[PDB]
Design a protein around this ligand. Structure first.
Ligand SMILES: OC[C@H]1O[C@@H](O)[C@H](O)[C@@H](O)[C@@H]1O
Ligand SMILES: OC[C@H]1O[C@@H](O)[C@H](O)[C@@H](O)[C@@H]1O
Ligand SMILES: OC[C@H]1NC[C@H](O)[C@@H](O)[C@@H]1O
Ligand SMILES: OC[C@H]1NC[C@H](O)[C@@H](O)[C@@H]1O
Lengths: 822, 822
């Protein structure tokens, strides 16, 4: 089963039926303004922040799913339909939805009218634009009225959906039928008070009618599928006062056979300095200058196509830094297009707003946005540079950090907990990755506040020493790091012991004391402590570097002395000091996280893939056997079947789901990289294939979700629904697979001083070429690959043989041809 | 005009069309279990706490409104319909909804098949019961299938609405097709862990089939109104695993012409003690003992009827305590049934869960639940007694309090703000009212903790002294009480100065300092300090009482000096000591709260109703001219047309709505009572009628909301929607209007030592009789009423002339006959 196909030439996914297993979305915009856009035009838009500045209302968990978006009702001689199929569900002669990069196109044809909508967010603009083309595809003339429709949200999404006792009375709008480029509608709830911003809804022609009151346009007792106004065939010209404000214009068109007409709609977010808030001395009329400039920049189809061409170019630019041409076009489309696109989206959204993330509780995660950085640095480094400052700015002086920050304000909060002891180290991971990529050492000197305190600024590097010190100065009785609230795994709450239902494990108070330690954070420390060590050394900090190395080696000794179960790695010591993820317990015998990560840190590695005696190999073989499924690798085994009070949230999920035996795809790339480390490329590629969008399109009815982007979790072998994903789009899997495949499978990764070429992918990719731009030079890396296990590359550069696998960076401007033999 | 009518004998309101102006609801239950039920079976049910143990999902702001409740899909030969109309919307031959006391009947008939559901919550039972009666009305034998449907919520409604990322994976059910009395379905999400409760949907017969998974039942791309399973005619026997759990049973019926059948369905809430959660060693199967028992008690129709008779007897004898017979039947039905009914509801719910209050943020409001008491103490005083203890236990040692408390835990919180300086005195009001009613002086001796601290208990009376001292020790420069965040008027935030959009006025940081005082709190102090002094006096605290009246005298003097604008009472002094509520200003010249409240406390009363020199008469006329509308009195005049940054939230509402120029019904009865005090019965009675459900039934299309219960706000003169209510059901209006009418218009009101009989209703009720049980005696009060302005009663009691208007309380069991002449 498949519901559409990739089109590589156009960089689109093409959906060919509306009857998908679930709503399938694209993210529009990439700067400050965003739209979630389903293949039925469902979703919503926000400026910068989904909780705080949401422009349009969308209902999660509606019946049916995704009824509510940017609809255009067509009334053709009494018959009413929508080219997005939903909400009217009228029969379509032709239907198509194409999700592209920063844009989508939805086309729907019925009874001789074809309606095509191009949705996108233009570069530099805080607006969503639709170019709608109506074509008469019959033998006879046609008259039709089109009704645009969109539903306003009242800005604060939290208040929107809970605070009716107030907010049913505050909705305001202005209507401008005779504006400079056509008709506009103004949503300005609370602009009267503290908001310095409003939304506009406009079309590039003088409208026949409008409507701004939902109840009037839809009618008592009706769903959107049955809206009264389009059925009536004419707008009611409703002005909202309180209740539910909408945006809606009506446009009657007449077409001869084969003729078409373009309509351009803009939903825009505008601000005014409060000096210029009002058109009038009495402050009753919003100043509309910005709104008229916006509509004037999109008054014509030529203007639209120009912006769309510019957007195409920007993508081409972004995607030119890394790419691959091989014999496997599923690999190719992932590395060249889809995975990098996702990374851009995750860098932007973190984990706040998907069709599963509700854009309310979660803002920008510390761990989440640091990790995303690893997949974003090659794309736009200047923006990664800024983001690093932003994250570091929510760090506390003692080295710990706010678990997340509010995107609109950049100020951290505790809304989803505090005291995650793995957080602080990810800062070093982000910065290491960024420096390797850019070589912009001047970042370590950037002055950066603690918890945004002005006056408190220290150099970035110093922030890093705090992170490093935090874990140094918080170790338990085996010398493993103290776990605190949780580690990378939010659901392993060893300091919790909750028996009060309905209070969240992420926010509920924690027990002081006990001796709970994390093998994960230990691994984490070994990996990133080495990065930190290497940066101390380079900044000329001799002794700090020597000291850092001593600690790193201690934590590594500890992992091997106290963190080893026999055939795999322990996960943790609980509050009482008892082992977790041991063969001693009947459930939760083996956990994936420390297996993946300890091996990337190099802990327990023998002298080859064929050294059955190395902890690293045993670990991965236990993982292979206990954790392996056709759909990826489950998190631990067996899943817990009763509530384990000492472990927190983990055993609260039914077996096979989320952290209780789900495939948490995010951690699969840790094993994939681990495998290349021990030199079993063939299997690392296997693993990559099980979870990767292009390899799973074939089972779209099983995966259920978008077949072009990774999801956070795939139901595991203990789940009745084994193989079905949830929480698509917004996941660290994206950036971690990008790292995995671009840098470890195919082998091309920047290091401090040169570019490493270390293919480890096994025989299924016998030959490829990578074009990598680094430090302004193009590297053309041409690989011949036997994929023999353990075999490792040798290189020639411009005709000359060199040693090891690191090509010192060539000056900017140069092209450097690398011949690779594995 | 009208959409149904009252049925006085049946104690029901009868809705005769499904096409009402807005969903009109009833509240089932009066103990700890509750159901919101619209006249289309829409709504939901919870246990104790609508945020925390919500059994069934419901969507606010759904398109259409109210698509979601308890549904019975009838499939008659392929043709599908619902007797609630919604969701399916088939044409009915007849429809009817009867809203009764603690139950409702909904009937729909279509093509020879009449389905009547009776809904209710039984006494002592944590369940909602449906007695379905399907009757063949054709002259031929008929066959059909019935599909019951309820949608489960995941207990924590806030989480349910926001946290899909977690909760889509924790839905969990059990199916019991062959239990002891029929088929049952068990919703058991998170019973696996910390929840000791599950839910049951069962029917008193063995069902042909079942469904527990929403998507299977409803179908993809379908709304409730197009549910797949009913249309297919067969259940699908789905066993939910995560996603959306539902309860549904199919039962096949066959009816001879004129024959009928009863099915009994039960939605119950059960709990096991910990050592009894599981049926099995393994802990995978819920112990069903409690649910078998519940389903057992509703196995037959006879048991249903009995429980309904018992519920009818509970209402008859709650309503025996206060009753009127008069020449105005609208007044009678308000007093004898509806106003009382509503007070039970408010007492139970505070402002927590309506079809407007979403049952998330609001719990049991300190201010609101104290005021509910005034209208509830005569119904079940023991429970009022408990409520005072619960409330007072959330007070702090300085006499300030938590603004509200969480219903499930009874522990106070700051979720909707802290430091509202009007809060503390309300506690005196409630306790005064309780003691006048019952004479249980021993309550002042009840030991009561502060903010629930073990060891902090003082007697209830000391809590009273802390509230009294809070105002005396928190006066500002004019000798008026400092205002804090706000007083009774939540939107008057004089210590705010907010420019940040998004942040709540209720919940944002206040400015330190400034000299902001409330005239309202002054009037409140004068009234309730007087009652405090009386509580001192009875307890022998003459030095406390003496000193207390001193302050009352001081504060009273300060209202006349510094709180008088010339023609009416000043509202406040802002952070800067500027008058607020003055004729000097262009907007908000006169605010209604101080006018009713001051005069209720006697401030500015003179010769009587025609002492034009008297401030109180000056004040009340101003109210009449400047605030009056045919729909009630508005809060201030003129409304604010731009943001007044120094007043807080009030100027943020568009003119005419809520606190900014809406009719805030809660405060009209202050003015009613005020007029009866001054002696203007006619105007008092006129103001009563402008806002009373009975008197507004004739303008249902304009009021839009339930015509049998007080709403919170009716759009005022300055709104385009003038006359349209919002926020029905949950409002202090119910308590305060019952006080007004039962106690000051009709004039029968308990005092500490006897029953005060002081009619002041004017000429439109020339004669009436009140029946009143008070401390175990029955007073039969016959009233002959001239209505002459200023004219007040003289009584003869059991044949004997008596002095003044107080009848000292007779023994328990006596019947005292009081003949009243005004
Ligand atoms: O707060 C975010 C966390 O919520 C937990 O309940 C989920 O199981 C985790 O997947 C997630 O990391
Ligand atoms: O927190 C509850 C309060 O919210 C405010 O926004 C409303 O205007 C008030 O009417 C309400 O009392
Ligand atoms: O708990 C595991 C994983 N869950 C999903 C969260 O977004 C991520 O931060 C966390 O690491
Ligand atoms: O003025 C706000 C007023 N209405 C809304 C609240 O229910 C009540 O507590 C308050 O007194």
């Amino acid at each position: 089963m498949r519901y559409g196909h990739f089109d590589d030439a156009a960089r689109e996914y093409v959906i060919t039926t509306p009857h998908t297993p679930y709503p399938w979305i694209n993210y529009l915009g990439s700067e400050q303004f965003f739209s979630l856009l389903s293949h039925q035009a469902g979703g919503y838009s926000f400026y910068r922040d989904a909780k705080m500045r949401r422009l349009t209302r969308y209902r999660y968990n509606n019946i049916p799913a995704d009824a509510g978006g940017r609809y255009l009702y067509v009334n053709d001689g009494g018959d009413v339909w929508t080219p997005s199929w939903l909400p009217v569900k009228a029969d379509l002669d032709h239907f198509e939805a194409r999700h592209g990069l920063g844009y989508s196109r939805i086309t729907g044809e019925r009874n001789g009218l074809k309606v095509e909508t191009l949705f996108f967010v233009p570069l530099g603009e805080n607006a969503e634009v639709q170019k709608v083309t109506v074509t008469n595809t019959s033998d006879a003339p046609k008259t039709a009225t089109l009704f645009s429709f969109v539903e306003f949200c009242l800005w604060n999404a939290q208040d929107d959906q809970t605070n009716y006792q107030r907010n049913l009375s505050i909705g305001e709008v202005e209507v401008e039928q005779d504006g400079p480029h056509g008709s506009a509608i103004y949503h300005k709830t609370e602009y009267r008070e503290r908001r310095d911003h409003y939304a506009v809804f406009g079309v590039n022609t003088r409208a026949d009618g409008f409507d701004t009151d939902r109840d009037t346009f839809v009618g008592a007792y009706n769903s959107l599928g049955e809206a009264s106004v389009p059925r009536a065939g004419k707008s009611a010209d409703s002005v909202a006062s309180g209740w539910y404000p909408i945006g809606s214009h009506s446009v009657a068109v007449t077409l001869q056979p084969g003729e078409s007409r373009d309509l351009v709609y803009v939903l825009g977010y505008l601000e005014n300095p409060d000096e210029e808030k009002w058109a009038d001395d009495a402050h009753q009329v919003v100043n509309k200058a910005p709104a008229h400039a916006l509509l004037g920049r999109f008054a014509t189809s030529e203007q639209v196509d120009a912006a769309l061409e510019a957007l195409n170019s920007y993508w081409t630019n972004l995607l030119s830094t890394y790419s691959v041409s091989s014999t496997d076009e599923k690999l190719d489309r992932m590395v060249n297009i889809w995975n990098q696109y996702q990374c851009m989206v995750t860098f932007n959204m973190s984990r706040s707003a998907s069709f599963f993330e509700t854009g309310i509780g979660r803002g920008m995660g510390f761990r989440d946005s640091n990790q995303d950085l690893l997949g974003f640095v090659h794309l736009i480094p200047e923006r990664a540079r800024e983001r690093i400052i932003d994250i570091a700015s929510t760090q506390f002086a003692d080295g710990s950090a706010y678990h997340q920050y509010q995107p609109l304000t950049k100020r951290g909060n505790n809304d989803i907990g505090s005291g995650f002891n793995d957080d602080p180290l990810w800062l070093i991971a982000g910065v290491a990755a960024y420096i390797k990529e850019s070589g912009d050492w001047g970042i370590l000197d950037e002055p950066v506040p603690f918890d945004n305190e002005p006056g408190s600024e220290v150099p970035l590097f110093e922030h890093l020493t705090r992170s490093f010190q935090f874990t140094v100065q918080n170790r338990g009785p085996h010398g493993l790091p103290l776990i605190g609230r949780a580690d990378w795994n939010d659901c392993l709450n060893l300091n919790c012991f909750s028996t009060t239902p309905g209070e969240s494990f992420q926010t509920t108070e924690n027990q002081a004391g006990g001796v709970a330690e994390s093998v994960f954070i230990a691994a984490q420390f070994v990996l990133y402590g080495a990065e930190y060590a290497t940066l101390a050394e380079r900044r000329g900090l001799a002794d700090v570097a020597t000291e850092a190395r001593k600690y790193v080696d201690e934590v590594r000794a500890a992992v091997l002395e106290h963190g080893w179960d026999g055939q795999w790695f322990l996960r943790a010591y609980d509050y009482y000091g008892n082992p977790v993820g041991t063969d001693a317990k009947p459930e939760g015998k083996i956990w994936i996280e420390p297996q993946g990560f300890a091996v990337m840190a190099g802990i327990g590695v023998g002298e080859g893939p064929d050294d059955a005696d190395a902890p690293a190999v045993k670990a991965l073989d236990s993982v292979n056997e206990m954790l392996g499924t056709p759909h990826g690798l489950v998190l631990q085994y067996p899943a817990y079947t009763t509530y384990q009070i000492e472990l927190g949230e983990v055993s609260t999920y039914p077996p096979g789901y989320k952290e209780n035996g789900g495939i948490f795809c995010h951690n699969n790339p840790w094993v994939i990289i681990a495998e290349t480390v021990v030199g079993r490329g063939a299997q690392a590629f296997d693993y990559y294939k099980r979870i990767t969008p292009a390899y799973r399109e074939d089972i779209s009815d099983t995966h259920k979700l978008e077949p072009y982007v990774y999801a956070q979790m795939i139901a595991g072998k203990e789940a009745v629904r084994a193989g079905e994903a949830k929480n698509s789009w917004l996941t660290g899997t994206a950036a971690w697979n990008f790292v995995a495949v671009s840098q470890y499978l195919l082998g091309v990764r920047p290091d401090y001083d040169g570019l490493v070429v270390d293919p480890q992918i096994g025989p299924d990719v016998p030959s490829y070429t990578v074009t990598r731009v680094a430090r302004g030079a193009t590297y053309e890396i041409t690989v011949t690959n036997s994929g023999a296990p353990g075999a490792r590359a040798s290189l020639t550069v411009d005709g000359a043989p060199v040693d090891g696998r690191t090509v010192p960076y060539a000056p900017a401007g140069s092209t450097v041809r690398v011949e690779v033999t594995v």
